[PDB]
Amino acid sequence: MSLWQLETNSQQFLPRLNGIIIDCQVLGPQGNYYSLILQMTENNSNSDYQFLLLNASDLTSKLS
Amino acid sequence: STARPRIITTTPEQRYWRQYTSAQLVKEHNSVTHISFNPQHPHDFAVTSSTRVQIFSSRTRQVIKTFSRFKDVVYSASFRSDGKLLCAGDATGLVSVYDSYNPRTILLSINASTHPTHVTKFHTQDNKILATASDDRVTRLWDISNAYEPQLELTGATDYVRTLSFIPAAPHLVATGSYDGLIRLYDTRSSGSTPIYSLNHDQPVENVIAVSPTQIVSCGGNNFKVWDLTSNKKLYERGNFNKAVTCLDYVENFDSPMQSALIASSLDGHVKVFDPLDNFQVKFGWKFSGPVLSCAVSPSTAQGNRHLVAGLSSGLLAIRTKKKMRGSEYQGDQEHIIHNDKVRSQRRMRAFERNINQFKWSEALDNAFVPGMAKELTLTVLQELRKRGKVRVALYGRDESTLEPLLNWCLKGIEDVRSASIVADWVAVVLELYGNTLESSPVLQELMIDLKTKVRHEIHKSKEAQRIEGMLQLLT
Amino acid sequence: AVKDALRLVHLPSCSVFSNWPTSGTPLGKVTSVAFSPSGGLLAVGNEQGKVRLWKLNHY
Amino acid sequence: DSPVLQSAYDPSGQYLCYVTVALDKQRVGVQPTQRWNENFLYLEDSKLKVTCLKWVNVAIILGMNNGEIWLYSVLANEVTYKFTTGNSYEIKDIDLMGNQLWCIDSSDAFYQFDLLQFKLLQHFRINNCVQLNKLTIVPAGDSVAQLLVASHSISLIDIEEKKVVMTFPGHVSPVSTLQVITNEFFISGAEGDRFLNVYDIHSGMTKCVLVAESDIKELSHSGQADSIAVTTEDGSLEIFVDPLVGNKSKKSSKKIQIVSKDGRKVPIYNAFINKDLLNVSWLQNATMPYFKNLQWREIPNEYTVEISLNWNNKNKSADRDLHGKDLASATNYVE
Amino acid sequence: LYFPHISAVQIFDFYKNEQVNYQYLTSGVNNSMGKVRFELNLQDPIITDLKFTKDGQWMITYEIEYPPNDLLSSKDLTHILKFWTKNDNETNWNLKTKVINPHGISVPITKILPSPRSVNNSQGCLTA
Amino acid sequence: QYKLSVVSGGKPALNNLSSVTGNKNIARLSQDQRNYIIPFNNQIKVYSVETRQCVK
Amino acid sequence: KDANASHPSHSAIQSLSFHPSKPLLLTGGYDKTLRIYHIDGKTNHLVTSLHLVGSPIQTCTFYTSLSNQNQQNIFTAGRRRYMHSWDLSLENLTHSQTAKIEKFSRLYGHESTQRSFENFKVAHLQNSQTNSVHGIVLLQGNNGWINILHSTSGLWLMGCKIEGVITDFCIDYQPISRGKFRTILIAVNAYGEVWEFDLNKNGHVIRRWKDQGGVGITKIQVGGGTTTTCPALQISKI
Amino acid sequence: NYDTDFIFLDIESTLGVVGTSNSDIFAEQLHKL
RNA sequence: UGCGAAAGCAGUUGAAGACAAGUCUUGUCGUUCGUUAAAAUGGCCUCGGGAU
């Protein structure tokens, strides 16, 4: 997951997620959380979605 | 998010005895006949060589006391159980008792016999009484208080008695081994002077030790046999030795994975470790320049670096040793809540691992073939790149100058079995990608010529191995 | 830098108070100061680990 | 010393009102003993202090040092009415029986108030009463015919005579409690004193002297002399069982203590004892009051309650495992 | 309830209806990087069989590791057997033994059967 | 004697429509931001964010 | 009576902070402990204490959101490349068995300008285009650099640069109209040159002046209105 | 399952099982506040 | 694509419609019917007042 800083065009990373990122959102009046949808494309027999709510402050999984 | 996985690149009893790395070699004026360890801290050991006894500091591994009063050759330096006294026997037949660390004063001097006194050992359970065995073939049992007549005079040996042992937990029992090949057990509680019985070794007995309260292990001739007092027959016997086994030592309850060890000298230059818990089977060995006459290992309660000592007839003494802002320190012992969120840094990565982590495929291959690079570690990076699917990718931007380091290793790695299959993959790709450049490069050609000769040589070996394999199947 | 180095300045007169601190006022190496939002309390921490409270009776 | 300056259970014993200081200002709060409320009545003046606090049958009347009595309604969280005496002398004590409200000033002047009419009915001063730190109006019928008053001795006064009736030899120190257990039997305790004297009103003889282990700060009587629980200054609660049945001096039978799991002792600052249940109250953190109900009849003689308090607590985040590895993250492969 | 996801295992608690763990049981490019473009044609090792002893203290896994394409050794599948142990209190299985190419080279382990309680106290298994 | 009953859950629900992008997530966070409501194909789970448990 | 007397500190008191409304005093130092005492003037008992392993405290502060009075937070930093936030809201201060601690350690590309989090301050910034108000954490950089972060999300909002070595800074507020205010960052050089930045306008300089006769400046502070020591509880009180 | 019941999995990832007084008003008001 | 073992053994790709480029010839498909049937320079965080 890449946060592009648009003022300076910089970017912050959160790598090694469980799956490829299908959807991204910033949730909160102050951007407290990031809600991501992960896909886990390794399993071709099915589409395996995992919903991950991260804490914006420290990018730690608040709820998977 | 998960932390990045790290790239994944003998017996425990052997690994422990491997640790006696530091080897110090000393010269003595004559053959070192006996070696003994002080039972108490600092557990200094005494070596009997020529006409003197020298005590070595455990930590310093250097002589700290020298007992040079003996006019003729000395034949023992055994300490008492508490370690204050040491007794020594002389070829003249005089047995002398000195205070350890005080060579000057002589506490007690006894004339056991006119013949040589080869063995002088303190009784382990009783401090007062001292045992002496002489070429007179009588193993007198002395008392320090009574220096004029032995308490008891064991007899019955028809040849030289050079071995004497006290069975632990049996103060009344005494074991003596003679060159007759007989090991005689005596009872000091009774009248004595006649063995309870005799155990036949069939070869001259050169040393007898009591491994446990019921088991005694005697080394004579080319083998050592363990005898059980309760059954009065040898349980086991090992004859791995080539020359005549001379000395043997036993240490129990030390910090090794193995509970107990039996050290045995050989006189072929070998001293080997035997495990009593696994039926006295070989587990370790050392080789020395010449025949070994004495062996010793530091006691169980060494309290410091452990020592293994070997004594050679040339006088050499071999030692192997196993070496053993005012609020910054608060730690919050009085506080309600203690929060610890620090994480230790990951162990240092190598250059090739950093390149793979950063997706530097070409540079990771370069790190593989660098001077002083372990062959196994070179094989991992080649396997990692293949697993990542980056074998052609690592080989695009290359010419003859930077291709030779890979081909040089392939020339040597084709010979190894583990790397043979990997070398075939990498060599197959480089030929498919650099066929044209090879035509215009003369140096690349000869690398392939010698590669073709070696790979042809490997084919013959593999064809050969199949034939022996067919042969082996026919036998079975 | 030194012990008891603390002064209170009246505003807008910009005149340092004379009666306090005194020679007997225990302040130590002043390293932290705080005023309560209301109530006129003054907290002064020092290099010894001691926080001392004073009340300004005017507030 | 305790952060709780004053405290008092309601007559039913289910709510505790306590006064504490925030910075320089006192705040009055009420908590439900049986089971948090963030609402306090704040005194806007640093000088103003609560001298007295008495439950009204949901109102609490607070004696002030300003010389006036504030009737405080807990629900609205505001003072409905303020009874102001003509003088400015601080109120030492107050007591209530229905509409009858009696108080005393530091000037030793008695006053009477009517809650229904909100009027100062009468005020008077009785000679031979130089100091007055306690006032208790005796329960005779449905009217007040006599008052128990004590400063260092104890005296009985009749309202209509406006004169003393009987005097009891009290403690050396100022009297701190003057509760009446039953008819012709009231107990008395003093500041920094370990002795409680039981006096007979009709006669005037010391029936008994109950002796506590340490200084007494509070006192609660159960039923009609059935039991008496006294909070000691050292933080332990003593219970006296049948104090009114050698005979002159009696000691406590049961003792109750609080200690944390780590080992620290937590003092008890107030307690309530109704029929067979005892309520204990202690402070956690700085000023938060915590409670516990127990059946003292079955409790052994020396009983120590054990409570869980934070002490060297390793901080566990719900989002991390023991090793700081995020719960969402997968476990890596290690040979 | 153990689900052998590709190259990993999901431990799922159907009483609570919530996943209790996700553990990688094989080597490969699992979470070292995100595969893009041609790297996305790579096949990680597949956990073909997963079984428990009757006692339940031991986990037996069988893996097939596939070679990359476009190589000489692009058709020599590797078959691996692994034995893991785990104390009941912890949640992570620990690899105790690894057997590479059991039953020979390129010979699949088509069946695994843990032993009954009678033999070895359930400390054995058959591979066929 | 025997009977069948569904016990465990199923996959989380998603707005599985090709055209809509970035609006696939249907799970909603409470106005107090104390719990996350997530629809499954066979139920709706309410997780408490603070304690990380399915409260309802 | 002394505040520490109930539970003493094992090192020097590096920072002190009174809670904006509640009667609590916060203490911090190189002991690595955050002790909170209930200041009544007479007893001063300890509400709670939080040891942070290997996190020396050079400064600490309470923070209350200017809009949501129920949001309560403590920020603490030291000579480290991270900062800790402790959410004290709801019942976390007293009743909770554990502490909700967050570590800020990401500078979003500006790690070179920032070496340590030890010197910092917290202010209120109003996003004028939406009228919403939140808190910001200001830091001191290497080369005149002031890095401003979001208080909750930790995102890097803006950076301000002065010439010379940045020695100290402070925050001043200017109300504009009903429900509006502007945050000014005041930063000073050791030489004595003072910059004033407009944090509501990307932190562009709005005023430059020099301290008359200043040399070897060490500190700068504003007083008489809302500040870190006298914070507001509503917009109208700015 | 090692109990009597059998657990079955259905391709919608569904696991089924086949097997055999003024005080009272004051308290309420205080709670509301 | 089907069966099979991993070895292999059999077989499979067509009709349109729309548009872009050249200038009538070619490509492409966020389009249909049927058949078991490479390449936008773009690489993965931080948490080291007093004595006198």
Question: DSSP string covering B177-214, please?
Answer: EETTSEEEEEESSS--SS-SEEEE-SS-EEEEE--SSS
The Cβ-side half-sphere exposure at G160, using a 13 Å CA radius, reads 29
Query: Which nucleotide shows the minimum CA-to-C1' distance to residue A13?
Result: I45
| Chains with ≥3 CB–CB distances under 8 Å to A | B, D, E, F, G
SS3 label, residue D137? strand
Q: How are the residues of chain F apportioned to helix, strand and coil, as percentages rounded to the nearest 5?
A: 0, 35, 65
From the CA of E6, how many Å to the C1' of I6? 20
Instruction: Output the six-digit token pair for F13.
Output: 């629900």
Q: Which chain G residues 36-95 have CB under 7 A to strand I?
A: 80-82
| Rounded Cα distance, E25 and E48, in Å | 12
**B260 CB contact with strand I at below 7 Å:** no
| Rounded Cα distance, B224 and D209, in Å | 92
The answer to whether the CB of B3 falls within 8 A of the CB of D326 is no
Instruction: Output the six-digit token pair for B92.
Output: 């003249």
Query: Which nucleotide shows the minimum CA-to-C1' distance to residue B1?
Result: I45
CA distance G68 to chain D (A): 17
Instruction: Output the six-digit token pair for D115.
Output: 């809650």
> Angle at the Cα of B118 (from B113 to B119), degrees rounded to 5?
100
Q: Pick from G109, G200, G208, G198: which is nearest to G162 by CA?
A: G208
Cis ω on the peptide bond leading into residue C12 (within 30° of 0)? yes
Q: Could you tell me the CA-to-CA distances from G59 to D312, G30, G120 in Å, in that order?
A: 23, 10, 8
| Rounded Cα distance, B228 and D26, in Å | 90
Q: Pick from B87, B121, B35: which is nearest to B294 by CA?
A: B35
| Rounded Cα distance, D100 and D94, in Å | 11
The answer to whether the CB of G158 falls within 8 A of the CB of G140 is no
- Are the beta carbons of E71 and B386 separated by less than 8 Å? yes
SS3 assignment for H1-33: CCCCCEEEEECCCEEEEEECCHHHHHHHHHHHC
From the CA of E37, how many Å to the C1' of I21? 29
Q: Pick from D5, D46, D11: which is nearest to D25 by CA?
A: D46
**E37 CB contact with strand I at below 7 Å:** yes
- List Cβ neighbours of B436 (8 Å cut-off, separation of 6 or more): none
Q: How far is CA B176 from the centre of its chain?
A: 28
Pairing of strands B260-265, B248-252: antiparallel
| Rounded Cα distance, B55 and B420, in Å | 56
- Are the beta carbons of B5 and E71 separated by less than 8 Å? no
DSSP label of D283: E
Q: Crossing angle for the helix pair B417-433 and B442-475, nearest 10 degrees?
A: 140
| Rounded Cα distance, D104 and D52, in Å | 11
The answer to whether the CB of E98 falls within 8 A of the CB of E85 is no
Burial class for D161, CB neighbours closer than 10 Å (0-12, 13-18, 19+): exposed
The Cβ-side half-sphere exposure at D257, using a 13 Å CA radius, reads 13
Radius of gyration of chain G (CA): 18
SS3 label, residue A26? strand
Question: Distance between terminal CA atoms of chain G?
Answer: 33
The answer to whether the CB of D105 falls within 8 A of the CB of D85 is yes
Pairing of strands D227-232, D216-222: antiparallel
- List Cβ neighbours of D246 (8 Å cut-off, separation of 6 or more): none
The answer to whether the CB of B339 falls within 8 A of the CB of G101 is yes
Instruction: Output the six-digit token pair for B424.
Output: 């075939």
10 Å Cβ neighbour count for B146?
12
What is the maximal distance between C-alpha atoms in chain A? 43
Pairing of strands B233-238, E8-13: unpaired
Which bases along strand I come within 7 Å of a protein CB atom? 6-7, 38, 43-50
Q: Could you tell me the CA-to-CA distances from C35 to B210, D43, D96, G120 in Å, in that order?
A: 83, 21, 43, 19
The answer to whether the CB of D210 falls within 8 A of the CB of D199 is no
Residues of C in contact with D23 (CB under 8 A): 36, 38-39, 41
| Rounded Cα distance, A35 and A21, in Å | 10
SS3 assignment for chain G: CCCCCCCCCCCCEEEEEECCCCCEEEEEECCCEEEEEECCCCCCEEEEEEEECCCCCCEEEEEECCCCCCCEEEEEECCCCCEEEEECCCCCCCCCCCCCEEEECCCCCCCCCCCCCCCEEEEEEEECCCCEEEEEEEECCCCCEEEEEECCCCCEEEEEECCCCEEEEEEEEEECCCCCEEEEEEEEECCCEEEEEEHHHCCEEEEEEECCCCCCCCCCCCCCCCCCCCCCCCHHHC
Q: Could you tell me the CA-to-CA distances from A18 to A36, E36, E109 in Å, in that order?
A: 11, 15, 30
The Cβ-side half-sphere exposure at C59, using a 13 Å CA radius, reads 13
Burial class for E17, CB neighbours closer than 10 Å (0-12, 13-18, 19+): middle
* Tokens 């196994």, located at residue: B376
Q: Pick from D217, D286, D206, D218: which is nearest to D250 by CA?
A: D206
The single-letter code of the amino acid at A40 is M
φ/ψ region of G82 (left if φ > 0, alpha if ψ in -120 to 50, else beta) reads beta
* Tokens 């042809």, located at residue: B456
SS3 label, residue E79? strand
Report the residue from A16, A18, A61 with minimal CB separation from D319.
A61
- List Cβ neighbours of D285 (8 Å cut-off, separation of 6 or more): G38, G45, G47, G48, G94
Burial code of D62-73, b = ≥16 C-beta within 10 A, e = fewer?
A: bbbbbbbbbbbe
Q: Pick from G182, G55, G171: which is nearest to G123 by CA?
A: G171
Query: Which nucleotide shows the minimum CA-to-C1' distance to residue B342?
Result: I47
Instruction: Output the six-digit token pair for B218.
Output: 């005697």
DSSP label of B90: B
| CA dihedral (A37, A40, A46, A52) positive or negative | negative
The answer to whether the CB of G187 falls within 8 A of the CB of G160 is yes
Q: Pick from B403, B399, B396, B406: which is nearest to B433 by CA?
A: B396
The Cβ-side half-sphere exposure at B355, using a 13 Å CA radius, reads 18
Q: Pick from G101, G110, G208, G207: which is nearest to G157 by CA?
A: G110
10 Å Cβ neighbour count for E15?
8
> Angle at the Cα of B20 (from B17 to B23), degrees rounded to 5?
140
Q: Pick from D15, D288, G29, D177: which is nearest to C46 by CA?
A: G29
Cis ω on the peptide bond leading into residue D3 (within 30° of 0)? no
Q: Could you tell me the CA-to-CA distances from G82 to B303, G85, G111 in Å, in that order?
A: 46, 10, 11
DSSP label of B74: B
| Rounded Cα distance, D68 and D317, in Å | 52
SS3 label, residue E38? helix
Query: Which nucleotide shows the minimum CA-to-C1' distance to residue G80?
Result: I48
10 Å Cβ neighbour count for G74?
23
**B4 CB contact with strand I at below 7 Å:** yes
The Cβ-side half-sphere exposure at D104, using a 13 Å CA radius, reads 22
Burial class for D309, CB neighbours closer than 10 Å (0-12, 13-18, 19+): middle
| Rounded Cα distance, A37 and G39, in Å | 49
From the CA of C22, how many Å to the C1' of I51? 15
The answer to whether the CB of C40 falls within 8 A of the CB of C55 is yes
| Rounded Cα distance, B182 and B180, in Å | 5
| Rounded Cα distance, E29 and B3, in Å | 14
For chains B and E, having 3+ Cβ pairs within 8 Å is answered yes
Q: Could you tell me the CA-to-CA distances from B83 to B42, D149, G215 in Å, in that order?
A: 10, 88, 77
* Tokens 């002297």, located at residue: D209
| Rounded Cα distance, G51 and G29, in Å | 11
CA distance D315 to chain E (A): 20
F49 touches chain D (CB under 8 A): no
The answer to whether the CB of D168 falls within 8 A of the CB of D190 is no
CA distance G89 to chain D (A): 13
| Rounded Cα distance, B71 and B88, in Å | 12
10 Å Cβ neighbour count for E1?
15
Q: Pick from D294, D136, D296: which is nearest to D201 by CA?
A: D136
SS3 label, residue B407? helix
| Rounded Cα distance, D161 and D158, in Å | 5
The answer to whether the CB of D275 falls within 8 A of the CB of D12 is no
The answer to whether the CB of G58 falls within 8 A of the CB of G14 is yes
Question: DSSP string covering A27-63, please?
Answer: ESTT--EEEEEE--TT-TTS---EEEEEETTTTEEEE
- Resolution of the entry in angstroms: 2.7
> Angle at the Cα of D321 (from G52 to G56), degrees rounded to 5?
10
The answer to whether the CB of D156 falls within 8 A of the CB of D164 is yes
The single-letter code of the amino acid at B330 is Y
Residues of D in contact with E95 (CB under 8 A): 334-335
Burial code of B404-440, b = ≥16 C-beta within 10 A, e = fewer?
A: bbbbebbbebbeeeebeebbbbbbebbeeebeeebee
Q: What are phi and psi of G123, to 5 degrees?
A: -140, -175
Pairing of strands D254-260, D302-307: parallel
- Are the beta carbons of D1 and G42 separated by less than 8 Å? yes
| Rounded Cα distance, A11 and A24, in Å | 16
DSSP label of F12: B
Burial code of E72-104, b = ≥16 C-beta within 10 A, e = fewer?
A: eeeeeeebbbbbbeeeeeeeebeeeeeeeeeee
Question: Distance between terminal CA atoms of chain H?
Answer: 51
Q: How far is CA A24 from the centre of its chain?
A: 6
Q: Could you tell me the CA-to-CA distances from B115 to B112, B136, B161, B194, G98 in Å, in that order?
A: 8, 6, 12, 21, 85
10 Å Cβ neighbour count for B253?
9
The answer to whether the CB of G6 falls within 8 A of the CB of G37 is yes
> Angle at the Cα of D146 (from D140 to D151), degrees rounded to 5?
125
Pairing of strands D313-314, B337-339: parallel
φ/ψ region of G150 (left if φ > 0, alpha if ψ in -120 to 50, else beta) reads beta
Instruction: Output the six-digit token pair for D274.
Output: 């109704």
DSSP label of B350: -
Which D residues in the span 295-314 are in contact with B, Cβ-Cβ below 8 Å?
Answer: 309-314
Q: Pick from B12, B17, B20: which is nearest to B257 by CA?
A: B12
Pairing of strands B173-178, B182-187: antiparallel
Q: What are phi and psi of B12, to 5 degrees?
A: -60, -35
Which long-range contacts does E73-82 make (Cβ < 8 Å, 24+ apart)? E73/B421, E73/B424, E73/B425, E76/E105, E76/E106, E77/E106, E79/E103, E79/E106, E79/E107, E79/E108, E79/E109, E80/E26, E80/E45, E81/E109, E81/E127, E82/E25
- Are the beta carbons of B1 and D313 separated by less than 8 Å? no
DSSP label of B79: B
Which long-range contacts does B232-241 make (Cβ < 8 Å, 24+ apart)? B232/B197, B232/B199, B236/B279, B236/B280, B238/B274, B238/B280, B238/B281, B238/B282, B240/B272, B240/B282, B241/B266, B241/B267, B241/B268, B241/B270, B241/B272
| Rounded Cα distance, G158 and G135, in Å | 13
The Cβ-side half-sphere exposure at B198, using a 13 Å CA radius, reads 15
Q: Pick from E79, E76, E77: which is nearest to E62 by CA?
A: E79
Q: In what order do the strands lie in the sheet with D288-295?
A: D268-273, D277-284, D288-295
| Rounded Cα distance, A42 and E4, in Å | 12
Which long-range contacts does D174-177 make (Cβ < 8 Å, 24+ apart)? D174/D131, D174/D133, D175/D133, D175/D134, D175/D150, D175/D151, D176/D133, D176/D134, D176/D216, D176/D217, D177/D134, D177/D216, D177/D218, D177/D219
| Rounded Cα distance, G106 and G126, in Å | 23
